[PDB]
Amino acid sequence: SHEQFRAALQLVVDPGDPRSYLDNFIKIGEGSTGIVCIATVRSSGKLVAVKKMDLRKQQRRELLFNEVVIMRDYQHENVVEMYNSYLVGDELWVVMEFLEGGALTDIVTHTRMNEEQIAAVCLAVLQALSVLHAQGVIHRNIKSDSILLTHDGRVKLSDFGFCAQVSKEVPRRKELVGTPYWMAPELISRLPYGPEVDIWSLGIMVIEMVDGEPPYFNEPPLKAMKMIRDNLPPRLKNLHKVSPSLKGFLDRLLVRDPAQRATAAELLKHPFLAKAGPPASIVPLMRQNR
């Protein structure tokens, strides 16, 4: 069954082994699906990132195809570019754009973002989501760990390992997929859901950018889930810090009823996003500049 799955992946990946053109693999990070390494392109000295995912260690292997579908089909300015995929032993390797500024997580855990920076991040994320959603793709893992930065403060959406597609023939998804504290209540309720779940998850990320962490982050994941499902929309710990404009924006995101929650395309017109600064405004938040 593992051997069966290897053979199958082999038919859809690029042939060969990128070890032949890459040097100095250095681990920089982990996920539940696998690790991330940087590597040097031998011929040129350029840097790339390489995601390595062991086929035997997945919750659900079939999700590994998401990596290949998104690469083949759904590219954009605010989406991490995937270059090639290979089967190397028992691992799927994906060679992709290196986002040398790291993940938004390191920022929200160590500094305070102002609203211009928050708005720039939301704007960038929402542009990527408007396009993904309009083509049937739901990310399902929106949180600060999935948002990556360039050295000059450009924002890109990453980690498509958990995504799903919808369409006329399959309008909703039913799988329990995401990270507990960021999951939409309808998803936790096991209701059929759509792209709207990404919008709730973004709201929780806005909570991360204002508070440093999502709500109920001290509760075990299952208790946190229960509270998300049953209670009113979670509140910012320091609501007193945010402008009325940020709060009105957040109120369009953290809406329990998915039918009433704003869409990505709606949100792109919200006056909060008029505060968005340029990428340069994000630059000082990064570890190498703080």
């Binding site: 659900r60 893992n141 329990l176 994941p221």
Partner: peptide
Amino acid sequence: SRARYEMAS
């Protein structure tokens, strides 16, 4: 608690 790990099915 404080888990950043994902859940599938």
